[PDB]
Design a protein around this ligand. Sequence first.
Ligand SMILES: [Mg+2]
Lengths: 434, 88, 148, 321, 49
Amino acid sequence: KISLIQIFRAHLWQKIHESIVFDICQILDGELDVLQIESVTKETVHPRKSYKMNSSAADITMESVHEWEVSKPSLLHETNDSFKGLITNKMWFDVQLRYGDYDSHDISRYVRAKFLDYTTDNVSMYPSPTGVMIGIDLAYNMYDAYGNWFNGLKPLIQNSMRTIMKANPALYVLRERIRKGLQIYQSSYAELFNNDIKLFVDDTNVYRVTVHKTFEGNVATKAINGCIFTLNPKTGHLFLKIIHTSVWAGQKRLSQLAKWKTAEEVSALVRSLPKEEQPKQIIVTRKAMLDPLEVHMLDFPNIAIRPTELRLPFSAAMSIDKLSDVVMKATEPQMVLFNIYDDWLDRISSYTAFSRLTLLLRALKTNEESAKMILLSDPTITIKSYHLWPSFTDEQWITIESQMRDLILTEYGRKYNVNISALTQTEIKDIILG
Amino acid sequence: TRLREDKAAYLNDINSTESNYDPKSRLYKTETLGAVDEKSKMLTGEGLKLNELNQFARSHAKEMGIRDEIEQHVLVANPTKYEYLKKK
Amino acid sequence: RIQEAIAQDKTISVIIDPSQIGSTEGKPLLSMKCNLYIHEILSRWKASLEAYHPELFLDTKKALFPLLLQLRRNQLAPDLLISLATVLYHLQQPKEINLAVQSYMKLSIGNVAWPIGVANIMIDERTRLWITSIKRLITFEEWYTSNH
Amino acid sequence: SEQIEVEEVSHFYQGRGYLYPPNDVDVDLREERISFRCYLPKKVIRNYPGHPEGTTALKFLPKTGHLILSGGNDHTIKIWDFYHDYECLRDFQGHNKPIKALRFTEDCQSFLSSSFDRSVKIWDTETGKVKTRLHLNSTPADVESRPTHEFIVGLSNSKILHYDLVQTYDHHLSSILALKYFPDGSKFISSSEDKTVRIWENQINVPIKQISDHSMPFLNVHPSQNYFCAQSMDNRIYSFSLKPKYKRHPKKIFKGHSSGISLAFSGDGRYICSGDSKSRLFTWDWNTSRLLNNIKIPGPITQVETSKVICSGAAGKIYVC
Amino acid sequence: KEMLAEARARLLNTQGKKATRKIRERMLEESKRIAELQKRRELKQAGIN
RNA sequence: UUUUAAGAACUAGAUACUAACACAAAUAGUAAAU
Ligand SMILES: [Mg+2]
């Protein structure tokens, strides 16, 4: 009972029912002509019909252009049928889910079983006393349809299910997850800048532990406000979702809770946004975020999640004040938007702007406060409220690139006990890129 | 809730022959339409995007960096110095 | 029906005075001003439709229709009008586009947005619908003031 | 909640506030920080009175000791010459219940009072006008003005609140007793009902350091900005440094007296004067670390020119030693 | 000399975690008492009992 | 009738204790392991 309760969560069951059937809401939402389809009319599904097994009801009513010939009910792969027994216009699907077991792993007997009984029963809700059943064993991934038949559907179903059972992601969510539990997995770059909108989520600043006095003597753990850091590398408007420690009040270990509230924020942000401002990808260095993100990213098959293949330096976000100045002032959690690049889109493209930016983050990662002084050594040219980095001239930006660059190389050779003079180019470019 | 207007990539061409959508990272790669060049141009694939518009330029300047460096500035490393080189 | 009067008055402009955003007495007036300003933005987008995402215009108008009617009738809750007005106020300031987006983020999170240059709310479905389109008005404005 | 205030004396106003050109008294209020090597007093000059109940508190005046101001538990506040002069300037009235604490405007024109009636008032020191009243359910304990501008009020209900509400500070558990600023603007030390100190940067909620090892009802900061002095209930004085290492030091300690209270240091840091329940002032040689003098004056709380100190206490009289 | 500080310190504590914990708890109680008192004392200096 | 703290400043780290904080990611007070 433990391992299962993992395997399904955030109502992964219900979500499965939506992904499958709703995705059919599309596929046969748009097939009007060839089957003589007026319109695709489905009943808004009460949230519990997915996991309630008492009794079922007609799902998606097909209301024909003209008229339809209902043969005697057969299976999807029960073949030879004379349609003209009846005629209807309105129809429906019954599409159902069950996790089978070594006694009953044969659906069809279940398909026609449930189908028949339901259809011939009162409580079962039907707009037409004709229809179709499509079941699935999640356990052995099987599926079927025992319906009445007017012509043309059969292969539409067949092939369409080939797709579904091989695609509609929720299933791929299981087959990932089941393999988690089982621990079976069969053995044996610059594109960041392409047109579609690419976002950076990095969560190391989300839950910040803070060490404090233990009544007697011990080391006390706590936390102080975080926020979720996301940006597109291109157009430089920062999305900070403020994390106000109130959030964590009473509950649990906040590792899991961190990851799940990060996911739920990122999702909510996405949903709320318009189709034009939505991303086509998401890129995160922390892979502990995979599952929470994904599981809340079932809802948008359009978007495609992609991890890092490569070593990355995003944890220094807070050490550059003004944003952190904002983090420490928040009375109640909220979004704030910012500007990443100061103004780097005039004198450059965002391209080497980002190269310099990563390098800045780096020398902020290794030696830190030396870099902070390097920046603000001469404050005698002053940063506006809108900028973050010290405003410069060409030369200043330039040489500071050189110097900040120099740190990790030198400190490197010294500190990691392998020489800087014996280096090969490609490892230099490596640490520089990562 | 899902926007019903914009099709999931994998439904674009149903036949299992079409092109492979690997549901983990949700990325079509080859394009879904390999048969009929659509009368009106139609998703042309993911790969059809990657070269386009803002990354080529980068590829060029980086070529100029390699070959210049044998001919000492570094694209990723010091950008603007090189950059204004490639300008000149 | 004073709301039927304010909507017919040609003495009200689209300009938002930030000092009125949280006023209880000025609620009916500010509500109409927000209605008038949104129409004005949709008007300029219309006038240059071919130049800025013409395929998103119709959907944006439809999502904003119910909000506009409410603004015209002064049916928005206090906290909601306050947040919307704040976003629109900053939007009227070219060099304050970032403060508008920041305010927008609060509103979308369910928090009250107060003028930044100068606690909580609840969000519904149809309400979530117009809050999303507001972001489109912001992106259009940034493009408009940038391309002329 | 109504309002009624009165004016003391017909002196009125070149056109000057009473507070303003002390100038006249022997010496100079503008005065350099160290008057000279310091002295301890034997002779008491003024009764003051007016109050029929022991003064809650006594303060002086922003800049130099031009005026003196007292808090009465009869719901009254009075201003005084502070030069031993008979006249008490203008009376203030407007609290329901006994006034617990006060603070002055760094510039010196505004004045703040906190009382057990759950209200806090901002006053015009030149008219006695109740300028503004600040709400909140909790009774408000010690309140300070920012040395440059927000109110900082310590509450019985854990929190400390900055007011224009700007910033709440929830970290403290139990009542808050006193708030100082170790370095102006940047940091302050709050001492709380829970036996701990919380140090913070300004306007930022989280606390920089936590110190706990009986209680600290009153804490004061040296004129050099180098030491802190708390009158722990446990009958001792604990010395702390405002400079960076907030570590209490063994070398300086004071236990010649038994006990809320004020501890003050003679300008030039030569002496420390504690006021205690028994009513005897304890004067210690800060440098040599020894009770140098002691008085049994009063039949005592706050103790504040090198020629004198001013005390108050539960007999309701302000005395000058 | 540091190990000798260690042992030399060790021998001289006879109790165990519990007793020491008590010593603390009790003293904390005493401070609570004294505090509550001087509360009442200063309230008496305002006359309200 | 009581009473003497050698006083002040500077500085560094070294041994310790600790902390559900951080290295396809997960453990607790009936039982533990070639
Ligand atoms: Mg046990």
